[PDB]
Amino acid sequence: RPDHKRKFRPNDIRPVVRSLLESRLENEVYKADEMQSISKEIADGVRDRIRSMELERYKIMVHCMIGEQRGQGLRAGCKMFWDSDTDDYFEEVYVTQHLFAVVTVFGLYQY
Amino acid sequence: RVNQDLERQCEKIEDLKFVLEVMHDARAFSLDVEQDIIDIKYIYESIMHFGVSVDPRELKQAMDLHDLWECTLARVHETEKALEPKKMQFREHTRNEVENFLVKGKAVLKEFRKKGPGRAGIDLQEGNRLRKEWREHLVQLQARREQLTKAEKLFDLPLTGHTHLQQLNEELTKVETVYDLYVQWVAVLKRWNR
Amino acid sequence: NSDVIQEEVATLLRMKFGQEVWNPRKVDSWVDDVVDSVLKNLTDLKKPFKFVVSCVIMQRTGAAISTGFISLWDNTFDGVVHVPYENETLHCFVTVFFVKLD
Amino acid sequence: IKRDNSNSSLRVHRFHQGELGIPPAARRKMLNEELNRCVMAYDLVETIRLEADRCLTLGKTEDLKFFGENIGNVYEQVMFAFDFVTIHTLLNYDVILDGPDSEFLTVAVPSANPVAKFGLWVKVKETTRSFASLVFPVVSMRLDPKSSALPKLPKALGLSKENVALRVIQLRFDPYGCRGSGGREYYALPCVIKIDLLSFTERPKQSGDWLYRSETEEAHKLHVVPYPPPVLEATDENPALRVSF
Amino acid sequence: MSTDRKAIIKNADMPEDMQSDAVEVALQALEKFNIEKDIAAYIKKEFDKKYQPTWHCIVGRNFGSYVTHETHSFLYFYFGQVAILLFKSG
Amino acid sequence: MSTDRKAIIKNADMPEDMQSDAVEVALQALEKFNIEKDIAAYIKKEFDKKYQPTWHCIVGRNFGSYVTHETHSFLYFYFGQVAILLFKSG
Amino acid sequence: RKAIIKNADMPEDMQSDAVEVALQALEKFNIEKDIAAYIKKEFDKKYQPTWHCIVGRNFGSYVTHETHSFLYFYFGQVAILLFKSG
Amino acid sequence: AIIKNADMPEDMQSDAVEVALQALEKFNIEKDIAAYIKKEFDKKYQPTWHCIVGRNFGSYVTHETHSFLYFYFGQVAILLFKSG
């Protein structure tokens, strides 16, 4: 049972995620091909970054989805099955004038 | 002091406005007032629990302060019931006067548009003098609207516009500002021709 | 199989999104409906394992979209399924994971 | 785990699986414990009736009705003991098989001068069949169809079903008769018998050292099968049966 | 001024810098004072200043969460230990 | 107005008649629902129906809220332990 | 050494933090008064008020669950209870 | 019937007489007496009461105004308080 210093807890990587996303939206507008390319870059870069972080016996899957901005109201559904004694998951929603993006990241432990 | 204010008379319209506005503010901040009363009784009960000997008359005053504030608030509407026929006469007088002044101001704007110095038959210097006279008249109208604004605040009218209305009011303010800028440009032209 | 999961989830997405037209008051309801129904399906499949389902909705009046994914790991156990679709008013993309509880 | 956050003193860390398709013997022993404490509660019931009769001779009506409600509650907890044991007998059903095996689970309590009997039959394999009237070894109670010409019991039981069960309950007392003792032409005798049919959910999934079922709360709620249903009663085949005991 | 808060926030239909300024105004009011009612008064001046009248704000850690928004003019966010809501209506 | 439903009602910028109407809309919403969010929602529904958009209402126990409201668009009151605020903006 | 723990609705990381807190409080402090007041002080001042905690060697209780704040455990011959209330 | 610690008026103590009487008469294990006191006092004097029962203990105050009581009966003692 990894602890505060060892359990996957969302407080560590989310500030990095938001900082990276805000830095990369500085000079881009929605365009589905490059948005897909950015999706691949986000997925593989985040996965390899966490794999190089090595939180103890944790494996992380990422969801990325970038859509052309339309300013709609949305509230998400969340339920699942877990041995989340040490496993964790979290979400994030942001809106830009050129796109909106929704991120859903889960995290499990080698039990 | 409030007990004495209710025990006296305040019939004069300025003193009448003063005591009603004070009453309204007290109602607005009686959150803070009763908060102070509760805190005072709270700390005094702490002292009593610790058993320090304090004046029993101080205790009677402390308990009766909130009770007499409630009796004071009852006396406020008791007094307002009697005053009501008097002050009301002033009230709708001010709504009607302010609304009529606004309508007459729109009519004066139409009259200024019809009778402005832009019509033919006027010399350039005479036209500029007439424009200056119209600007002075508009400044006097602004002063009159400030006096009626003091009336509106004294007679409970919503001064500001509302959402779209207030941004229209701000557009009118910007029109006045750019008129002042045009006056400054006229001064610059006066420097140029000199 | 991954294609079997894809076709079953696509069938349920057809049954859930056959004619629905956008209203957030109902869009959140459809998000909840998809989560409920696909997790119900995966619970019908439940072995001492782990199931993961996501639902995403977007509207179209001239927009575009494109998706893709790659994973890097010791590739023995875990799996992933991607199902795209579009209908009357909305694109529907649902990604399904199965995780083998070690 | 032991995580020593001192200066440098060492740590203890070790996990292991636990147990296989666990040997449940402690849980049969637990069921036996339930039975014995039911017996002891019964014994308390007789004792309290003795002292209640003492009060009846004297006239302490307050204590009389007191014991009334108390032992009524006692019988209520006895009923919870029965269905509680029923649920866990359902739970202990699966991992024990070294292969296809028998379908008996009956207990009589106590061994000497019995007061209650528990018995149950459950179908086990997909590789199973259907046969004649149910044979209960220890219960000494016989269920037969109306006529001996009938090879099996009436079809309303659902013999073709795989996930079905049936149970027998005997009691050497009459608990609820104390309430309606007024207004009667007749009086009862201390003997209560109970018969019912049951069903369950899943033939589970065996692979390796592990074995999976449905896990949620619905998997932890009883599936009562009252008999006979009106739909099967509408069938021309009468569900009446022979009872010997 | 501390600007050290890490948000746990997910609700958005509004401009982006106005999201950031809603965050910054709400947090800066708490920074500057240990006085809550004055903090709220500062909130209303500061944000009806930064993003026009009129905004209405409710601050606390016990209250329900639903309001009516001017279109693309509402932020719902959490910070520190307080749930905070900031919507434009008028 | 049952004894279990007694409340203190002293804060208002309203006409008295719809203040009286507030009693029965609260009664109807507390009869129809017991979740405070649901009671407030039904009060919001009926009240904004009868008195047009847009109203905002709140209930909580860690209160901070200071609003720029137009004239006769304010109401504040307790249901014993339950604190309720209501105004017009939108 | 390790505490016997039978209750939970509260995160594991600050379970470990509470275990180390009990370790320190037992190490330096040796009266139910000082240990209890101490643990209350640190646990409030680092996890925000208001924890209310009952420490002792023989008592019994249940009241109601407190939303994601739920613990009841044993160590040695003493027992400890911890929760939100206000 | 031992009472020396209180942050209360005195009428609720008059009620507390009988609630302690029934708490002692009905139940003995503290796990359920605590919940029983919770139900009775919450239905009579609103949420949220919280109760602790023990028979050799030392407890120091942590609460807010008029929300404390602390009493002994023989060896056993019972504690009650508002907090939320």
State how far the Cα of E65 lies from the Cα of C17, in Å rounded to an integer. Answer: 29
State how far the Cα of F48 lies from the Cα of F42, in Å rounded to an integer. Answer: 10
CB of G2 within 8 Å of a chain A CB? The answer is no
CB of G16 within 8 Å of a chain D CB? The answer is yes
What is the three-state SS of chain G? Answer: CCCEECCCCCCHHHHHHHHHHHHHHHHHCCCHHHHHHHHHHHHHHHHCCCEEEEEECCEECCCCCECCECEEEEECCEEEEEEECC
State how far the Cα of H39 lies from the Cα of H69, in Å rounded to an integer. Answer: 17
CB of C10 within 8 Å of a chain A CB? The answer is no
State how far the Cα of C83 lies from the Cα of C96, in Å rounded to an integer. Answer: 8
CB under 8 Å to E13, separation ≥6 — which residues? A71, A72, A73, A95, E69, E71, E72, E74
Unique residue bearing structure tokens 């304090």:
B54
Tokens of G36: 């209890």
CA distances from F83 to F8, F61, G24 (A): 10, 7, 43
Residue E86 three-state SS: strand
Residues 7-46 on A with a CB inside 8 Å of G are 7, 9
CA distances from A21 to A29, A36, D135, H84 (A): 13, 15, 73, 41
State how far the Cα of B187 lies from the Cα of E3, in Å rounded to an integer. Answer: 48
Determined by: cryo-EM
Residue D213 pairs in a beta bridge with none
CB under 8 Å to A51, separation ≥6 — which residues? A60, C72, C73
- What residue of D is the nearest CA neighbor of G21? D5
Residues E54-89: b if buried by 16+ CB within 10 A, e if exposed: bbbbbbbeebbeebebbeebbbbbbbeeebbbbbbb
CA distances from F18 to A111, F25, F72 (A): 62, 10, 11
State how far the Cα of B185 lies from the Cα of B177, in Å rounded to an integer. Answer: 12
Rg (CA), chain H: 12
What is the three-state SS of A34-82? Answer: HHHHHHHHHHHHHHHHHHHHCCCCEEEECCCCEEECCCCCCCCCCCCCC
**Do H78 and H7 contact (CB within 8 A), yes or no?**
no
State how far the Cα of F80 lies from the Cα of F8, in Å rounded to an integer. Answer: 6
- What residue of B is the nearest CA neighbor of F70? B158
Find the distance separating the first CA and the last CA of chain G, reported in whole Å: 32
Residues B148-165: b if buried by 16+ CB within 10 A, e if exposed: beebbebbebeeeebbee
Q: Would you tell me how many other CB atoms lie within 10 Å of the CB of residue D133?
A: 15
Q: How many whole angstroms from its chain centre is CA C43?
A: 15
DSSP characters for D47-102? HHHHHHHHHHHHT-HHHHHHHHHHHHHHHHHHHHHHHHHHHHHHHTTSTT-SSS--
CB under 8 Å to D20, separation ≥6 — which residues? D95, D209
Unique residue bearing structure tokens 């001046």:
E45
Residue E60 three-state SS: strand
- Is C46 within 8 Å of D205 when comparing Cβ atoms? no
- What residue of G is the nearest CA neighbor of A86? G12
> Whose CA is closest to E84, among E67, E68, E61?
E61
Find the distance separating the first CA and the last CA of chain B, reported in whole Å: 65
State how far the Cα of B126 lies from the Cα of B132, in Å rounded to an integer. Answer: 10
CA distances from B77 to B12, B16, B37 (A): 18, 14, 21
- Is G61 within 8 Å of H55 when comparing Cβ atoms? no
Taking CB atoms within 8 Å and a gap of at least 24, the contacts of F40-43 are F40/E64, F40/F84, F41/E66
Residue D78 identity: V
- Greatest Cα pair distance in chain G: 33
State how far the Cα of D37 lies from the Cα of D45, in Å rounded to an integer. Answer: 12
State how far the Cα of A58 lies from the Cα of A55, in Å rounded to an integer. Answer: 6
CB under 8 Å to B185, separation ≥6 — which residues? none
Class of residue B94 by CB neighbours under 10 A (exposed 0-12, middle 13-18, buried 19+): middle
Q: Which parts of chain C are beta strand (E)?
A: 50-53, 56-59, 79-86, 90-99
**Do D117 and D138 contact (CB within 8 A), yes or no?**
yes
Task: Determine how β-strand C50-53 pairs with β-strand C90-99.
Answer: antiparallel
Q: How many whole angstroms from its chain centre is CA H77?
A: 9
**Do A68 and C63 contact (CB within 8 A), yes or no?**
yes
State how far the Cα of B174 lies from the Cα of D157, in Å rounded to an integer. Answer: 90
CB under 8 Å to D92, separation ≥6 — which residues? D24, D27, D28
CB under 8 Å to C57, separation ≥6 — which residues? A74, C22, C27, C30, C31, C90, C91, C92
What are H's interface residues with G at a Cβ cutoff of 8 A? 29-32, 34-35, 38, 48, 50-60, 62, 64, 81-84
The residue length of chain E stands at 90
**Do A106 and A60 contact (CB within 8 A), yes or no?**
yes
State how far the Cα of B147 lies from the Cα of A74, in Å rounded to an integer. Answer: 51
Class of residue E50 by CB neighbours under 10 A (exposed 0-12, middle 13-18, buried 19+): middle
DSSP characters for B107-165? HHHHHHHHHSTTSSS--HHHHHHHHHHHHHHHHHHHHHHHHHHHHHHHTT---S--THH
**Do A57 and A85 contact (CB within 8 A), yes or no?**
no
Q: How many whole angstroms from its chain centre is CA E58?
A: 8
Å between E37 CA and nearest CA of chain A: 31
Residues C18-49: b if buried by 16+ CB within 10 A, e if exposed: eebebeeeebbebbbbbbebbbebbeeebeee
**Do D221 and D194 contact (CB within 8 A), yes or no?**
no
> Whose CA is closest to E6, among G45, A25, A16, G49?
A16
Q: Tell me the HSE value of G26 on the side-chain side, using a 13 A CA sphere.
A: 17
> Whose CA is closest to A46, among A32, A33, A64, A29?
A64
The residue length of chain F stands at 90
CA distances from F66 to E18, E42, E70, F69, G56 (A): 20, 10, 19, 9, 47
Rg (CA), chain C: 15
- What order of strands is seen across the sheet that includes strand D224-225? D105-109, D116-122, D164-171, D192-199, D224-225
Class of residue F47 by CB neighbours under 10 A (exposed 0-12, middle 13-18, buried 19+): buried
DSSP characters for D101-136? ----EEEEE-SSS--EEEEEEE---SS----SS---
Q: How many whole angstroms from its chain centre is CA F81?
A: 14
- Is A68 within 8 Å of C63 when comparing Cβ atoms? yes
CB under 8 Å to C36, separation ≥6 — which residues? A77, A79
Triad G83, H66, E59: Cα angle to 5°: 60
CB under 8 Å to D5, separation ≥6 — which residues? G20, G23
CB of B50 within 8 Å of a chain H CB? The answer is no
Q: Which parts of D110-240 are beta strand (E)?
A: 116-122, 142-145, 164-171, 192-199, 205-207, 210-212, 224-225
Q: Which residues of H touch G61 (CB under 8 A)?
A: 30-31, 34, 51-53
Task: Determine how β-strand H49-54 pairs with β-strand G59-60.
Answer: antiparallel
State how far the Cα of D64 lies from the Cα of D56, in Å rounded to an integer. Answer: 7
Number of H helices, E strands in chain D: 3, 9
> Whose CA is closest to E86, among F64, F40, F59, A22?
F64
Residue A68 pairs in a beta bridge with A99
State how far the Cα of G52 lies from the Cα of H62, in Å rounded to an integer. Answer: 7
- What residue of A is the nearest CA neighbor of C27? A74
- Is E12 within 8 Å of A93 when comparing Cβ atoms? yes
Q: Tell me the HSE value of B82 on the side-chain side, using a 13 A CA sphere.
A: 9
